[PDB]
């Protein structure tokens, strides 16, 4: 039993970017609820730029604000700040940050009629993923382990805030 991927990953990315672009104008599609499907990819992509955000506040602006204190640069510095920490900590949040950073900037550039930049960003992303993050992706089996990473959100006993039952007094 060897299931093959019908659509290319770039098509999914385009669907995600396109969806986000449509979501801010006219919601087109449906509401996936009760009905387990064999497509965790689209769900994972959605969660990649919706999970942490819904438990954050407005990462799309906050993350760019809290890190806007130090003199940065253009897009060449945005996606580069994600890879910066990737070099010394390929944690799940780094993979998510790398994807959301590119997706957000690309979606914005698409609306700004800057496909030229989008193509460059995507080109660099693919190159990086098949060069420096090649072994990492090979270890994670692509998005294999990622599917189990976004399974929950409140379940964490590493550094999660100790409140209520745990630490009531402080």
């Amino acid at each position: 039993a060897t299931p093959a991927s019908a659509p290319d990953t770039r098509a999914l990315v385009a669907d995600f970017v396109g969806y986000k672009l449509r979501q801010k104008g006219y919601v087109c599609g449906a509401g996936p609820g009760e009905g387990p499907a064999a497509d965790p990819l689209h769900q994972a992509m959605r969660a990649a730029g919706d999970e942490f955000e819904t438990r954050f506040r407005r990462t799309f602006s906050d993350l760019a604000a809290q890190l806007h204190v130090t003199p940065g640069s253009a897009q060449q510095r945005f996606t580069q700040v994600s890879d910066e920490l990737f070099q010394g900590g390929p944690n799940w949040g780094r993979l998510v940050a790398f994807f959301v950073f590119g997706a957000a900037l690309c979606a914005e550039s698409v609306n700004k009629e800057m496909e030229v930049l989008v193509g460059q960003v995507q080109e660099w992303m693919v190159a990086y993923l098949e060069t420096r993050l090649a072994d990492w992706i090979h270890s994670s089996g692509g998005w294999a382990e990622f599917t189990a990473l976004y399974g929950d959100g409140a379940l964490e006993e590493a550094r999660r805030l100790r409140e209520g039952n745990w630490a009531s007094v402080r």
């Binding site: 954050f56 890190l67 910066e84 550094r159 999660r160």
Partner: peptide
């Protein structure tokens, strides 16, 4: 370039996502 800055978004994102 700026690992300190990268670490900021990293740690903040990691903690916030998994319920800060």
């Amino acid at each position: 370039i700026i690992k300190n800055i990268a670490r900021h978004l990293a740690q903040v994102g990691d903690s916030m996502d998994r319920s800060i």
